[PDB]
Amino acid sequence: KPFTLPILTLGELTNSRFPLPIDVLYTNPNESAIVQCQNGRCTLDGELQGTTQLLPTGICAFRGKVTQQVQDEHRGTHWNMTVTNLNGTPFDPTEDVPAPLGTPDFSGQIYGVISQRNTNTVPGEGNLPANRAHEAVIATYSPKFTPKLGNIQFSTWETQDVSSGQPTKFTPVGLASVDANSHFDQWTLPSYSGALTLNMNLAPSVAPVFPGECLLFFRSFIPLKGGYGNPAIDCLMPQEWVQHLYQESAPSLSDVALVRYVNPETGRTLFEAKLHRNGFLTVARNSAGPVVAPTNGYFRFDSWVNQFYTLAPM
Amino acid sequence: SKPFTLPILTLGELTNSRFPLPIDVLYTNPNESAIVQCQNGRCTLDGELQGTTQLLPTGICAFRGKVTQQVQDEHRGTHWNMTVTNLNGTPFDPTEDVPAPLGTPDFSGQIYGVISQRNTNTVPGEGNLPANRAHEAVIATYSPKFTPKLGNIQFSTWETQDVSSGQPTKFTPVGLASVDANSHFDQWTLPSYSGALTLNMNLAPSVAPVFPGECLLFFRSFIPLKGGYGNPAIDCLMPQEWVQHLYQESAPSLSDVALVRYVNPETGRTLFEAKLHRNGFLTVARNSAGPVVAPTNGYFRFDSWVNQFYTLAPM
Ligand SMILES: C[C@@H]1O[C@H](O)[C@@H](O)[C@H](O)[C@@H]1O
Ligand SMILES: C[C@@H]1O[C@H](O)[C@@H](O)[C@H](O)[C@@H]1O
Ligand SMILES: C[C@@H]1O[C@H](O)[C@@H](O)[C@H](O)[C@@H]1O
Ligand SMILES: C[C@@H]1O[C@H](O)[C@@H](O)[C@H](O)[C@@H]1O
Secondary structure (H helix, E strand, O other): OOOOOOOOOHHHOEOOOOOOEOOEEEEOOOOOOOEOOOOOOEOOOOOEOOOOOOOHHHOOOEEEEEEEEEOOOOOOEEEEEEEOOOOOOOOOOOOOOOOOOOOOOOEOEEEEEEEEEEEEEEHHHOOEEEEEEEEEEEEOOOOOOEHHHOEEEEEEOOOOOOOOOOEEEEEEEEEOOOOHHHOOEOOOOOOOOOOOOOOOOOOOOEOOOOOOEEEEEEEEEOOEOEEEOOOEEEEOOOHHHHHHHHHHOOOOOOOEEEEEEEOOOOOOEEEEEEEEOOOEEEEEOOOOEEEOOOOOOEEEEEEEEOOOOOOOOO | OOOOOOOOOOHHHOEOOOOOOEOOEEEEOOOOOOOEOOOOOOEOOOOOEOOOOOOOHHHOOOEEEEEEEEEEOOOOOEEEEEEEOOOOOOOOOOOOOOOOOOOOOOOEOEEEEEEEEEOOOOOOOOOOOOEEEEEEEEEEOOOOOOEHHHOEEEEEEOOOOOOOOOOEEEEEEEEEOOOOHHHOOEOOOOOOOOOOOOOOOOOOOOEOOOOOOOEEEEEEEEOOEOEEEOOOEEEEOOOHHHHHHHHHHOOOOOOOEEEEEEEOOOOOOEEEEEEEEOOOEEEEOOOOOEEEOOOOOOEEEEEEEEOOOOOOOOO
């Protein structure tokens, strides 16, 4: 079965690491961190890895139940919630995954909305349940962030109106802050089972091997609740590529696919890239920053090549 | 002729094309009195997007634009006029043959979400990272001030001051503010995209069974509530992944109807069959309302092109 990529353009792609559209292609050759994100991880023959799942609505989402308000040194009102799988089934910590699929894969203060729909109903209210929603923050670097253990903590501005024991949804929206105390680092993984524990079942780190090459990312700018900043989240492949590869399950005929970024209006190749078996792109570029190209551009699979292939410089 | 196909995503792997929600259940309601004419999640089987449908899951019920004015409510809350662009940031051209900017909500109600802003500019001499803010907001799509086809809408906030004019603004939808009587939630009533006395234009057509004994089959999602009582749902004709797939493939439609079977892969058994109509919606032979009780690892498989006169096996 022939390997293919979707023919979605850049303006028709979304980030696999946060629910955002792709804004630009981006490189950063001098990156010192190990790149080992856990969402947006899929091999070219369709094997999902890390915490990657298929739903755009599941990325950095949680489902579960609030148990109780809990004490925390930091500003706000804090709440513990058990978390299930996104489909509502109990999370089984013995599954070979780092954490429930969809769990955030970076250090930071994730801002979103917690909403609840009660299980019990009121006969006087048409046998309909009570609801509430409030803004919430999840500090993924907190020692109380333990999604692999089945529970996490979030904070609210709201001091009282979060109910215990009721079905709870977290809808991510952006970051609370990128100030010095907010520990935003997109390449630092959370400790999924808590402080001082080793993460397990990780999707592998990715890196260029060939001289002169660097990773190419699909970059999205992420909203902020407050403060100064222009934070971004870079994914290895957009969510639509995860979904496509998973569907197709095309055998990988070598370790490296040659892809061409094409202008469909003109037919011209803007640049070429290596698409590696584990699901990431490299290019021959010696600079950091956006790739300035039209958003109607798209990657086209050309052929299977190998580690010895020399890319034309961007 | 390029063969027609559906994605092999299961129900637990599909999302709603009318609001950013996972699909929860398949659903019928034969006795529905409203005309079904939603504008998001509209795609022909040969890949033609219709209505306000676009491809991004992040674009559904999203807005992009700039705030122009603050207006305090008589009683409570603050209203903000917002001039909207296309989601890709280019100016919205109202003479474009669409009902409204792609992604515009397609139903009456109070849509609850978060408005966020990232300022364009920084203060000369004063540090070079832009200022940001986000607050909860509500968009009343039934409001006379909801005129996205004219290039502007209004949202309201609890926040009374901290929303900036002339700065890039994003609306991230989250759910509904209310489903009380005064909140006018009706998923099949279209907004008046240009205001109340003006006719909507360039609409995707209404959908309905033709053949006796059939009813529409929907992909149903439950939508969060900011407050109050209720368990509101949003029904789409096809999930967003089917829109994306059909658009990609652009397979010619070889009859008016693609016969599809909902299959249990564990047993290989067909649970039921359905008609997938050329204009992009499903019907089944069912004479009851409510969820279809089936495993979420079940999925629709294309069987063959049939005629509109084909008689469905009763569900
Ligand atoms: C819920 C809280 O209300 C306050 O007025 C705001 O200043 C906070 O940002 C937050 O939204
Ligand atoms: C930089 C400042 O951060 C705060 O959270 C906001 O409320 C202000 O509007 C401003 O953007
Ligand atoms: C921003 C507003 O703050 C208040 O405390 C809340 O009661 C409202 O629901 C809203 O969130
Ligand atoms: C029914 C009530 O509606 C309000 O908005 C909520 O704040 C309460 O928690 C409760 O759900």
